[PDB]
Every structure is written in C-alpha cells, then in structure tokens.
Amino acid sequence: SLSSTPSALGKLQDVVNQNAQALNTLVKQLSSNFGAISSVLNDILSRLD
Amino acid sequence: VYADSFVIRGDEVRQIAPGQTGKIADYNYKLPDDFTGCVIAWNSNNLDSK
C-alpha cells in the first residue's frame, strides 16, 4: 500500500510544501517597489542624491 | 549660536540651503544636509551697490 499509493505520506509532504511556499514568498517579496522608484537598492543609491 | 554673514547675488540666495547646488553652494559656502537653524536674507543694493 505504501509503494502503490504516491500520496501516502501526504502530511510530511504538506509540511514541506508549506515551508517551501513561505520561503518562496519571502524571497519573491524582494522584487516589490513598496512605493519606491525601484525594487533595487543599488538603483536608488545610484540615481538619487 | 553661529552667525555666518556674507553678501551674494539675487539668484544665488536659493543656493544657501541643505542639498542645493550652484556656484555659491559648491565652492564658497556648503550647508550641511542635517542643518538646524535659520537662513535670513535681504536685498541691500542701497548699501552694497554704488
């Protein structure tokens, strides 16, 4: 039964997926302007006084 | 208190301010960015223009 059913261990896999999704959201929130002129620090620090 | 008095042109008064640029504020009198104080000015062509 363990070998035949791919979704047998669906709780540990869900935990892993939840952690991966949280980390992906955290790392993808670095591309947001949040109101600034750019999402890159080195652009604001190179274009503005 | 520190009173820095000097005579400039008319279109150069705006150069006396933090972060401003111009021939007055980059070679003669640079104001710090974190400046706390007053900048008073007055036309005196009756006293400095013969």
Binding site: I37, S46, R47, L48, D49 | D11, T21, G22, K23
Partner: protein
C-alpha cells in the same frame, strides 16, 4: 529657431557620450529641476535614447 509650445521640438540623442556636467555647471540657466535623478549622478549613469 526654438520651436513653439504647441509644436515643441523633440530630438532623439542616442549613441554618443553626454557630458551632463558641462550643462550642470553652467550658470546660464535659471531652473535645473531634475525629477527621479540627480545632476551630480548624471555623469555616472548610462541611459538610452
């Protein structure tokens, strides 16, 4: 022969080297208002068209 308001003349400066410091240091201008950029950093920036 400066153009008119309703027919403002647009020129595309491209594929060259622009010495923005020359215009920036000139005293023959009344207003030099830069938005989104700074004149002191214009000499170190490479734009296009």
């Amino acid at each position: 022969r400066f153009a008119s308001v309703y027919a403002w003349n647009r020129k595309r400066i491209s594929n060259c080297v622009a010495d923005y410091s020359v215009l920036y240091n000139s005293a023959s201008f009344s207003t030099f208002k830069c938005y989104g950029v700074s004149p002191t950093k214009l000499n170190d920036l490479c734009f296009t068209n």
